[PDB]
Design a protein around this ligand. Structure first.
Ligand SMILES: *CCC(=O)N1CCN(C(=O)OC(C)(C)C)c2ccccc21
Length: 292
């Protein structure tokens, strides 16, 4: 083939991922084979084709797409570590706040770009945020969820995490607005600051109830229309809202204000990526070099 395996990077949502070298250019890449349940779906065709052109410095670059033997191989730029591993590596000391702020600022730039082209991620999580040794962070697998769907289990039966999923998806609404990615990024922001996942649910109802226990059980006052969501139940227990001061210490008041806006229940109220970039939390943002 055009690409020689270097080693297995891991299992992805849709198939195995290898670090590979392009024979002709000598470039090293992450090669994702997409295994689906007849030919590639025309939905997958339309979506993947848009992704080759959706280029930004905070989006992992899709270098090429090979479609052969009725299967897709997506060839991505290679980055050496993900945020999940970097957070685990930093658990004793935590990621320094100026670096958290830089990462959040760059991720919001990537989101602002994709959202302005009407593309969303829908499955943001620390595993698909990739970092280099210079200070950049990039969104991986952008757009793959609309192209292929989000499965309950991966092809190797691993459970797809619910910890970053927005409440409107958990309540069964099948319209995903760009707000779903702001929610996930807010959860990741809180996790970087506190060194603990914010809502580590292990089932859809456990995920919802963890959200409710922190933010209050939603009602029509805070989220007009919530009681019309397909999976809303009037019998959900009523929990009161906790103050964010207890949820993300030692984050400052600007950071807590930004977080609360990214975690509004109503997707119509939730801050957009563009507005979030103008928030005073980023007034003193810098681009540090990480240790790793
Ligand atoms: C999943 C569809 C959706 O966008 N919905 C569902 C209900 N909803 C809403 O306002 O419904 C009426 C009260 C107008 C019937 C709502 C509200 C906020 C966000 C998303 C939705």
């Amino acid at each position: 083939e055009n690409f020689q395996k270097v080693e297995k990077i891991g299992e992805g949502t849709y198939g195995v991922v290898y670090k590979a070298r392009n024979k002709l250019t000598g470039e090293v890449v992450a090669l994702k084979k997409i295994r689906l349940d007849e030919g590639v779906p025309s939905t997958a065709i339309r979506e993947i084709s848009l992704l080759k052109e959706l280029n930004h410095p905070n989006i992992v670059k899709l270098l090429d797409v090979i479609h052969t033997e009725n299967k897709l191989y997506l060839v991505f730029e290679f980055l050496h570590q993900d945020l999940k591993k970097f957070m685990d590596a930093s658990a004793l000391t935590g990621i320094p706040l100026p670096l958290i702020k830089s990462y959040l600022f760059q991720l919001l730039q990537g989101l602002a770009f994709c959202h302005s082209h009407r593309v969303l991620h829908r499955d943001l999580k620390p595993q698909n945020l990739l970092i280099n040794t210079e200070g950049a962070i990039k969104l991986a697998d952008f757009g793959l969820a609309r192209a292929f769907g989000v499965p309950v289990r991966t092809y190797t039966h691993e459970v797809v995490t619910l910890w970053y999923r927005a409440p409107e998806i958990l309540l069964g609404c099948k319209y995903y607005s760009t707000a779903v990615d702001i929610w996930s990024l807010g959860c990741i922001f809180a996790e970087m600051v506190t060194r603990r996942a914010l809502f580590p649910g292990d089932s859809e109802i456990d995920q919802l109830f963890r959200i409710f226990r922190t933010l209050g059980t939603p009602d029509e006052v805070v989220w007009p229309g919530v009681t019309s969501m397909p999976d809303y139940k009037p019998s959900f227990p009523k929990w009161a809202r906790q103050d964010f001061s207890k949820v993300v210490p030692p984050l400052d008041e600007d950071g807590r204000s930004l977080l609360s806006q990214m975690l509004h229940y109503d997707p119509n109220k939730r801050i957009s990526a563009k507005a979030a970039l103008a928030h005073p939390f980023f007034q003193d943002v810098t681009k540090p070099v990480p240790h790793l």
